[PDB]
Amino acid sequence: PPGGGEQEPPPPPAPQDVEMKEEAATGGGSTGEADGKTAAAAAEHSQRELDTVTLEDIKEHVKQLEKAVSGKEPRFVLRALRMLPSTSRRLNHYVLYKAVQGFFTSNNATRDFLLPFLEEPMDTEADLQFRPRTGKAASTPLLPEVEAYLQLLVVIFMMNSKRYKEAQKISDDLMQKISTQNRRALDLVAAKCYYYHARVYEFLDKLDVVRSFLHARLRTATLRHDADGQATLLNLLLRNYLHYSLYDQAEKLVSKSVFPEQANNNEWARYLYYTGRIKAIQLEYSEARRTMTNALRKAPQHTAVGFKQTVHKLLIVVELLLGEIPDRLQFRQPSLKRSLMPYFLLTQAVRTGNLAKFNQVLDQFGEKFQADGTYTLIIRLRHNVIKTGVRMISLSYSRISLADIAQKLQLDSPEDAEFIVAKAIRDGVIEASINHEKGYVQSKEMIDIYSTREPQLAFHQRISFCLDIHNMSVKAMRFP
Amino acid sequence: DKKFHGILDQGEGVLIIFDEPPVDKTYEAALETIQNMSKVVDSLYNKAKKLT
């Protein structure tokens, strides 16, 4: 009781200090300015809801003795939130439940008491037509149930809480969704709950009847609103279709839903990456690396970014497949350095011409590549090792025996050492001829490449590109 | 020592002599502008990137 009564009594009110200022300012705003007048294309309540997801990601950790959040639920759920003269008593009810935690004891919600914390939208003239309240009054309890996820006989409490929000989601899909942004501000509440709708299901449940419900969700999308409904319903469509073998890749080629034209700078950034791997996994190399690069330089400024630990790995998988390689550790971190050393040792073998050096990696770190889920692209680098090597040898040696190149590439056979060189010319790596009767492979010396048209093609790509950024500097300037 | 330029042969001693002032003025005096302009965009960070 002294170790309790000095360390337990400040966890109730100082969260009550900041929760009368963040979602009470959201409840004070997004009931009267999302159901109210307007929250326009330049709104604040979405970014305010962006402020009330991230703060509560790392806010709550403990099972909430002293009712420091276990008493917030009997506070924050007895809410009509209809109009100002009936919420002037509710502005007292933000303080009337504070002494319920203090003078008395509330109901400590420890893994059992969430069932009398969900049935309240009948109590004291509550509604569901005001879904700028009730979609947020879903998400204000729907987040902290599932934020820790706590995975011990809880899943049904998360489910029935989603079912009441799914009842709000059907009223979203059918009933009066126009110019109140009832779809728009709840497409985020659709999108943000889907990740809590998935990590429940990616932990212990199925995946696929939600997909047909997501097709029914994609049905009404772009069918009433063409803003942030075309965007988040397609990355959340793709998120396990890539990991499954179902159709979902040539469908997304001819699909019209490729461009929502705006997706709020962070869901748009990874959007070019989930379809960036689709061209990577189905052999479309050169088209992929520009939507892989564009999916990199549109991401914000966080540090614990473990998906960015994957895109920097994957972006130069396909560039090893094309030949080009940048320095990958050019932004090396204390958390990037350990995530590069098996994969950086791979491209060490690629810039060399050795053949079973590839085999000395693929037995040492063959298990690591299957953890990242990338092995099926790794296995085909032996075509690109041998074309790197045959370009390397033909440029160095001019008149080399074909019964010498195989011993240097440890090919163990001169009789197909002619044959890779045949496919080197069929692909077009080296030009010159082979004296198959003698055995030497002669190469012609290069000639005046300066007086060829091809450096103008190095220019014309970049003349037209540099006039574009001068035009974009004009088009983005005179907003005043 | 580049006081004279040419080539020497080893088999029979043939000195193929050639000359051209190739070009120097056009490219490298336009190349150093690029690294001057790189430092200008670097100095744009001290009035734009810090500021807005």
């Binding site: 220019f459 970049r462 003349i463 540099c466 006039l467 950024i469 001068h470 974009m472 500097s473 004009v474 983005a476 300037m477 005179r478 907003f479 005043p480 | 336009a30 502008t33 690029i34 302009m37 200008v40 965009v41 744009l44 009035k47 734009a48 500021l51 807005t52």
Partner: peptide, 30 residues
């Protein structure tokens, strides 16, 4: 190619010259 490269940087320095006159007056004037 050099001269067009300069054209992009100059208008970008002009872009900050409008972002200095956009943000630093909405709090001042209103």
């Amino acid at each position: 190619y050099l001269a067009s490269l300069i054209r992009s940087v100059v208008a970008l320095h002009n872009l900050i010259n409008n972002k200095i006159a956009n943000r630093d007056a909405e709090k001042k004037e209103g």
